[PDB]
């Protein structure tokens, strides 16, 4: 079954760090970064080859204008929320995430969620067409918005978001569905009478992977770094197991991945 996702995330900061934009908005299709806007560049730009090739000029200019308009509203929001919380200076951050999921071409999720200072602020409930106030300072926002706007947002999440996701999926189909096999190394180092065995998988796509240590052929005291990105749109993971010196040969790393018809099996040599 064919599952695809469109997710936009946005941040407004009083304190991005030296030489960094206070305002950043990026989009992802199936977890792949494909567009980016920020307050320094003041333009939407491609982050994949496929969006770069297949979107027209009106796409880039249209969204740039929306992006510039949003920035101004978002600058104000941060200002408002600080004044509202009676705060002078310091470090404050507004965050938003929204988008839609399709399954066999049909919509299954539509969402819109906001945070202030790392915690939930509001979320849109598409069924009831209301906003939830997860904090008291979200009450004036819930009111201001519900006495339109909610009909507009519902339409965006069920119609606009879904038709564009279908379009993106068609534009990027080859790239989004690609596979790249992991390059795996087993590394052992002995210290304090413990043999630590490492299985490290490099350069896999897509993101999900399962890497297990087997002792005498049974799944095992492991520790995992989880899945972390490389710079090039592939992923990385490592898993360790503690063993007794001399028992190296009873251990075998198993890697299960969409790129591999049969699990990879790797040993310490």
């Amino acid at each position: 079954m064919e599952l695809h996702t469109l997710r936009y995330i946005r941040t407004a900061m009083t304190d991005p760090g030296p030489g960094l934009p206070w305002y950043v908005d990026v989009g992802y299709v199936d977890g792949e970064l494909f567009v980016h806007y920020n307050s320094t560049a003041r333009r939407y730009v491609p982050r994949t080859e496929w969006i770069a090739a297949k979107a027209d000029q009106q796409y880039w200019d249209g969204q740039t204008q929306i992006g510039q308009g949003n920035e101004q509203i978002d600058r104000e929001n941060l200002g408002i929320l600080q004044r509202r919380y009676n705060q002078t200076g310091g470090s404050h951050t507004v965050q938003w995430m929204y988008g839609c999921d399709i399954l066999e071409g049909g919509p299954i999720r539509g969402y819109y969620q906001m945070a202030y200072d790392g915690r939930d602020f509001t979320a849109f409930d598409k069924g009831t067409m209301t906003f939830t106030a997860a904090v008291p300072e979200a009450v004036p926002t819930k009111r201001k918005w519900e006495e339109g706007y909610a009909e507009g947002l519902k339409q965006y999440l069920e119609e606009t978001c879904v038709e564009w996701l279908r379009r993106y999926v068609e534009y990027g189909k080859a790239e989004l569905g690609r596979r790249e096999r992991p390059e795996v190394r087993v590394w052992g180092k002995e210290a304090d009478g413990i043999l630590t065995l490492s299985c490290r998988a490099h350069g896999f796509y897509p993101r999900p992977i399962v890497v297990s240590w087997l002792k005498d052929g049974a799944v095992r005291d492991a520790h995992s770094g989880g899945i972390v990105p490389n710079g090039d749109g592939t992923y990385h993971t490592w898993v360790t197991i503690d063993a007794q010196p001399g028992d190296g040969d009873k251990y075998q790393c198993r890697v299960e991945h969409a790129s591999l018809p049969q699990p990879g099996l790797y040993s310490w040599e």
């Binding site: 929306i66 308009g69 509203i73 929320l81 201001k144 918005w145 606009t160 978001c161």
Partner: peptide, 9 residues
């Protein structure tokens, strides 16, 4: 395609 912001918080 991104949301056009409607009004402030």
């Amino acid at each position: 395609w991104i949301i056009r912001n409607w009004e402030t918080v």
